[PDB]
């Protein structure tokens, strides 16, 4: 007697979050390359 | 959110991701878009890979769930940030030339792996329970290891042409 985890909701949620993603730009994490600049020099 | 989901990028695929980024953005080299091995076929590979590697598998519920989910997830998110600023002309060209082209099609492995890199922060949007999280991260890592096992055979960076100057004008 065991209820396995269900991927349906996760995908529902994940796609719903993807719907909120505007066309910005793909960027890789800081450890990989980091293409972002830090707000400073002040 | 409460738990920042660390999808964990495979260290075997990191050198490839760094090279991918460099090849596209810095080298400005781009391959001929038409992908014989599209995302749909990759999903099919992965799905059947489970049942053939195992013996008495019944996780097809989740396998099919994942395939359907990934397909739509990749499709819906395609164009937003599943491609670099340099890949814009590819997106533009596909839609303009083939308005009937599926976003889950035309592109191959590099774009599906692209998804797994961006899904890291995407999972930070989604408050998933431990059960579903562990199970899912399992599949994702199984997928990642499936790709990583074929990093040299599947992923090919040699057949990349330096994108023509006029084509650069369709990106930047």
UniProtKB/Swiss-Prot annotation, chain A:
| Record note on quaternary structure | Component of SIN3 complexes. Interacts with SIN3A in a complex composed of HDAC1, SAP30 and SIN3A. Component of the SIN3B complex, which includes SIN3B, HDAC2 or HDAC1, PHF12 and MORF4L1; interacts directly with all subunits. Interacts with TLE5.
Q: What is known of its domains?
A: In the context of the SIN3B complex, the PHD-type 1 Zinc finger delivers the H3 substrate to the HDAC active site. The atypical PHD-type 2 Zinc finger has a structural role raher than a substrate recruitment role, wedged betweem SIN3B amd the HDAC and stabilizing the SIN3B:HDAC2 interaction. Also interacts with SIN3B through the SIN3 interacting domain 2 (SID2). Interacts with MORF4L1 through PHD-type 1 in a SIN3 interacting domain 1 (SID1)-dependent manner. The polybasic region (PBR) is responsive to the binding to phosphoinositides (PtdInsPs).
Question: Where would you find this protein in the cell?
Answer: Nucleus
Domain of life, source organism: Eukaryota
Region named SIN3 interacting domain 1: 3-42
Q: What does this protein do?
A: Transcriptional repressor acting as key scaffolding subunit of SIN3 complexes which contributes to complex assembly by contacting each core subunit domain, stabilizes the complex and constitutes the substrate receptor by recruiting the H3 histone tail. SIN3 complexes are composed of a SIN3 scaffold subunit, one catalytic core (HDAC1 or HDAC2) and 2 chromatin targeting modules. SIN3B complex represses transcription and counteracts the histone acetyltransferase activity of EP300 through the recognition H3K27ac marks by PHF12 and the activity of the histone deacetylase HDAC2.
- Range of the intact protein held here: 200 to 241 of 1004
Specify the protein name: PHD finger protein 12
From Swiss-Prot, chain B:
One GO cellular component term of this record is:
nucleosome
Region Sufficient for interaction with PHF12: list its residue ranges.
Answer: 4-152
Q: Is the RNA-binding keyword given for this protein?
A: no
Q: Which organism is it from?
A: Homo sapiens
Q: What is its main location?
A: nucleus
Its recorded name reads: Mortality factor 4-like protein 1
Molecular functions (GO terms): chromatin binding
Task: State the function annotated in the UniProt record.
Answer: Component of the NuA4 histone acetyltransferase (HAT) complex which is involved in transcriptional activation of select genes principally by acetylation of nucleosomal histones H4 and H2A. This modification may both alter nucleosome - DNA interactions and promote interaction of the modified histones with other proteins which positively regulate transcription.
Instruction: Give the result of residue 61 to A, as annotated.
Output: No effect on MRFAP1 binding
Keywords, sorted A to Z: Acetylation, Chromatin regulator, DNA damage, DNA recombination, DNA repair, Growth regulation, Nucleus, Transcription, Transcription regulation
Q: Where is this region: Interaction with RB1-2?
A: 133-154
* Keyword DNA damage (UniProt): yes
- GO terms of biological process kind: chromatin organization; double-strand break repair via homologous recombination; fibroblast proliferation; positive regulation of DNA-templated transcription; positive regulation of double-strand break repair via homologous recombination; regulation of apoptotic process; regulation of cell cycle; regulation of double-strand break repair
Q: Which domain of life is it from?
A: Eukaryota
| Occurrences of domain MRG (ranges) | 4-172
Protein location:
Nucleus
Per UniProt, subunit arrangement is: Component of the NuA4 histone acetyltransferase complex which contains the catalytic subunit KAT5/TIP60 and the subunits EP400, TRRAP/PAF400, BRD8/SMAP, EPC1, DMAP1/DNMAP1, RUVBL1/TIP49, RUVBL2, ING3, actin, ACTL6A/BAF53A, MORF4L1/MRG15, MORF4L2/MRGX, MRGBP, YEATS4/GAS41, VPS72/YL1 and MEAF6. The NuA4 complex interacts with MYC and the adenovirus E1A protein. MORF4L1 may also participate in the formation of NuA4 related complexes which lack the KAT5/TIP60 catalytic subunit, but which include the SWI/SNF related protein SRCAP.
